[PDB]
From Swiss-Prot, chain E:
Naturally occurring in which organism (per UniProt): Homo sapiens
Subunit structure: Interacts with EAF2. Associates with UBR5 and forms a transcription regulatory complex made of CDK9, Pol II, UBR5 and TCEA1/TFIIS. Part of TBP-based Pol II pre-initiation complex (PIC), in which Pol II core assembles with general transcription factors and other specific initiation factors including GTF2E1, GTF2E2, GTF2F1, GTF2F2, TCEA1, ERCC2, ERCC3, GTF2H2, GTF2H3, GTF2H4, GTF2H5, GTF2A1, GTF2A2, GTF2B and TBP; this large multi-subunit PIC complex mediates DNA unwinding and targets Pol II core to the transcription start site where the first phosphodiester bond forms.
Disease: A chromosomal aberration involving TCEA1 may be a cause of salivary gland pleiomorphic adenomas (PA) [181030]. Pleiomorphic adenomas are the most common benign epithelial tumors of the salivary gland. Translocation t(3;8)(p21;q12) with PLAG1.
Miscellaneous comment text of the record: S-II binds to RNA-polymerase II in the absence of transcription.
Known role: Necessary for efficient RNA polymerase II transcription elongation past template-encoded arresting sites. The arresting sites in DNA have the property of trapping a certain fraction of elongating RNA polymerases that pass through, resulting in locked ternary complexes. Cleavage of the nascent transcript by S-II allows the resumption of elongation from the new 3'-terminus.
Complete-protein stretch covered: 132 to 253 of 301
Name used for this protein in its record: Transcription elongation factor A protein 1
Residues in TFIIS central domain copies: 9-122
Gene that this polypeptide is encoded by: TCEA1
Localization terms from the record: Nucleus
Organism superkingdom: Eukaryota
Curated annotation (Swiss-Prot), chain F:
Listed Gene3D superfamilies: 2.20.25.10
GO cellular component: nucleolus; nucleus; RNA polymerase II, core complex
UniProt xrefs under Pfam families: Zn_ribbon_RPB9 (PF02150), Zn_ribbon_TFIIS (PF01096)
CDD domains for the chain: Zn-ribbon_RPB9
Organism from which the protein derives: Sus scrofa (Pig)
Protein name: DNA-directed RNA polymerase II subunit RPB9
Length: 96, 141, 204, 49, 122, 116
């Protein structure tokens, strides 16, 4: 509806992608933090992460909470097809 | 000015501007060429883009002079005007675009195919049609 | 923005390349202008390159033989006092962003092209800013040639090689100004800095 | 499409592509193209019963 | 207090500026010697520039255009009404003050917008 | 609004402009023959630097009969009153800032298109 004020120094598409990525990253971080808060003291992922022997908190978040957002060349999945990423989707869809 | 549409023919050591190529096919008339290239004469931005590589070509009008102009740049250019003309005519009738047809005459469709190439190039330039993707396997065999 | 860190930057530093991928300059403002962005954007405009094409909105060439005919409604010609002109109108917002004015744009054009051309400029008051350029002394195409050869490369304001300039407030304390106070602390300060996209380092 | 699905004159290897943004219709019958079978949806149901 | 001069171009500029003051009937409403005012402004401009070059002609043309424009008759009103001294109007610069409230407002808002348009760097 | 194109009637060629050095009248002349014509446009060449040109000129109504396009019932057709119409973005480059959707009515023999 053209109600999006462009961010200082960014085009309309650039700021649109910026808000989208910010929301998605916030969701991933919040879900990961909740997953970390959920773990018990007898869990083994926590024991092997806090000691630094193997893995990190992001691995726990991806195993339990959510895998997250994929990227190529630092951007979301490009429109490999004509104005869509896969045949199962619909033209000009920028949803999550 | 700038933005001159040119061609790179096979077995020709140097590139050649397009209008000389069209007139080499025998289209001495000017409206025929633009009819072959531009399919609608109502959008000025499309039609103006051919003017740069149209004013570059007003020296050559007849067929024979165009054939000699082509033959001057051949792989083995002739030493006589007849040699140049026949060599360029043969290389156009045989080497260029075998897929559209190598029959006795194919100018009536070779000209349309060249016009389609030029029209596609102009469409890409104007931004009315995005570029083709090499990684897309719809374009691979 | 882009800085190209990592192995490519290591190759660029090791193999001293006369041209890097993304050269840039960090500019620190000296006076009070480092504090008020209003008096820093004027410096920014003084730095960034600005040709004629950056401010032109639309352009057109007409064959108006009689100067008083004025094929387009323009009362300025009568009060001002080749049969063809080159009317050029300029975008208002871009014209104001550079804090520029037509009275000196015309002077730049005249200095660039000698007496071959004569430019007539609309006043700032009018809503539509226009420029009537007439050659005075195969000239039908000569206006097209010059306009394709002056619109692109005119250098109205700023210096070359500077594609764009970013006004930026630093967040890390590394670029922040550091001054020892009177009593002895360090008290990092925050002031406006600029990042270009080319290299001059001498005019800058 | 109907003739190909009946497989009477146009063999199943031929692919018909119609573009709408530019009025073109492309037909390919050469070798080397890569294709996979898929089900057919008529309106919202399947031709498989 | 306008000392008359002898330069033909100066008198031409004076009469054109006076006739510019004749626009809008503000002089008729006020009833002032607009010719004297035109001579005073021309003399003040000449004092500022000390010449009759391109700057002279373009400054006179700019002043004429500013005065005779009907979109801001308030400047003509308050220059013929004695609200603004002639000398300050002579040393007036460009358009930033001899403009209506709407043009000043739009210039201010585009100046504020270019702030964000030129920050960048996230 | 723009500069049109006129073709020579004799030899089917472009008509170049030519000012009359005596009559001070712009005229159109060929080159392969001594042909003259009266120029009425009073214009030679324009150029829009902004290039913010409407794209509804090339929006073919055939777009409606496409299965891989969105369908919405929020902006019905103004004239026929049809409640459903597909939409799509610029679908082309050069767009400095374009996110608007160019609707097309999903009705047979309607062709109603608009931008919001
Ligand atoms: Zn002719
Ligand atoms: Zn409808």
């Amino acid at each position: 509806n053209n109600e999006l004020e462009p961010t200082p120094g960014n085009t309309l598409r650039q700021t649109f992608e910026n808000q989208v990525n910010r929301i998605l990253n916030d969701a991933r971080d919040k879900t990961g933090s909740s997953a970390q808060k959920s773990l018990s003291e007898y869990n083994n992922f926590k024991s092997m992460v806090v000691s630094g022997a193997k893995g990190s908190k992001i691995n726990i978040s991806q195993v339990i909470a959510v895998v997250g957002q994929q990227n190529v060349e630092g951007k979301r999945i490009p429109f490999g097809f004509k104005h869509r990423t896969l045949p199962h989707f619909i033209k000009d869809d920028y949803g999550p | 000015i700038g933005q001159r549409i040119v061609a790179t023919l096979p077995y020709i050591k140097q590139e050649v501007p397009i209008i000389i190529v069209f007139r080499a096919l025998g289209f001495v008339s000017d409206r025929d060429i633009l009819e072959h290239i531009i399919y609608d004469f109502e959008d000025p931005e499309m039609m103006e883009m051919v003017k740069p590589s149209l004013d570059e070509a007003f020296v050559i009008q007849e067929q024979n002079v165009a054939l000699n102009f082509i033959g001057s740049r051949g792989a083995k250019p002739g030493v006589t005007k007849e040699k140049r003309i026949k060599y360029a005519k043969e290389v156009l009738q045989k080497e260029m675009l075998p897929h559209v047809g190598v029959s006795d005459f194919c100018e009536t469709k070779k000209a349309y195919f060249l016009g389609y190439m030029v029209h596609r190039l102009l469409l890409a330039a104007l931004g009315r049609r995005e570029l083709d993707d090499r990684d897309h396997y719809g374009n691979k065999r | 923005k882009n800085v190209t860190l990592g192995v490519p930057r290591l190759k660029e530093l090791i193999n001293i390349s006369k041209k890097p991928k993304t050269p840039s300059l960090t500019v620190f403002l000296l006076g009070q202008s480092a504090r008020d962005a209003e008096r820093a954007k004027d410096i920014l405009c003084r730095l960034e390159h600005t040709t004629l094409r950056k401010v032109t909105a639309n352009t057109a060439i007409y064959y108006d033989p009689n100067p008083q005919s004025t094929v387009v409604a323009e009362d300025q010609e009568w009060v001002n006092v080749s049969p063809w002109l080159l009317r050029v109108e300029l975008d208002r917002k871009h014209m104001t962003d550079r804090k520029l004015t037509m009275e000196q744009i015309a002077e730049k054009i005249n200095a660039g092209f000698g007496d071959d051309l004569n430019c007539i400029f609309n006043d700032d008051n009018a809503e539509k800013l226009v420029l009537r350029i007439r050659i005075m002394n195969d000239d039908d195409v000569f206006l097209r040639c010059i306009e394709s050869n002056m619109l692109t490369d005119m250098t109205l304001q700023g210096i070359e090689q500077i594609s764009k300039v970013y006004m930026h407030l630093p967040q890390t304390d590394n670029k922040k100004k550091i001054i020892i106070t009177e009593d002895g602390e360090f008290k990092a300060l925050q002031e406006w800095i600029l990042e270009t996209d080319g290299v001059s380092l001498m005019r800058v | 499409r109907k003739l190909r699905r009946q497989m009477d004159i146009i063999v199943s290897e031929v692919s018909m592509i119609r573009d709408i943004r530019e009025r073109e219709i492309r037909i390919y019958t050469d070798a080397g193209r890569i294709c996979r079978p898929l089900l057919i949806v008529e309106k919202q149901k399947l031709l498989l019963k | 207090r306008a000392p008359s001069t002898s330069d033909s171009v100066r008198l031409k500029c004076r009469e054109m500026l006076a006739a510019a003051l004749r626009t809008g009937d503000d002089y008729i409403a006020i009833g002032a010697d607009e010719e004297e005012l035109g001579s005073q402004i021309e003399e003040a401009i000449y004092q500022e520039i000390r010449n009759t070059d391109m700057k002279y002609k373009n400054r006179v043309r700019s002043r004429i255009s500013n005065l005779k424009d009907a979109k801001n008759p308030n400047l003509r009103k308050n220059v013929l009404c004695g609200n603004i001294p002639p000398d300050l109007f002579a040393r007036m610069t460009a358009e930033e003050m001899a403009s209506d409230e709407l043009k000043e407002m739009r210039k201010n808002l585009t100046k504020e917008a270019i702030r964000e348009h030129q920050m960048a760097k996230t | 609004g723009f500069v049109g194109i006129r073709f020579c009637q004799e030899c089917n060629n472009m008509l170049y402009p030519k000012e009359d050095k005596e009559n001070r009248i712009l005229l159109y002349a060929c080159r392969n023959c001594d042909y003259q014509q009266e120029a009425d446009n009073s214009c030679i060449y324009v150029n829009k630097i902004t290039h913010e040109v409407d794209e509804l000129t090339q929006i073919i109504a055939d777009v409606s009969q496409d299965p891989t396009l969105p369908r919405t019932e929020d902006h019905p057709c103004q004239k026929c009153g049809h409640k459903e119409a597909v939409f799509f973005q610029s679908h082309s480059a050069r767009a400095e800032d374009a996110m608007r959707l160019y609707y097309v009515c999903t009705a047979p023999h309607c062709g109603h298109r608009w931008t919001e």
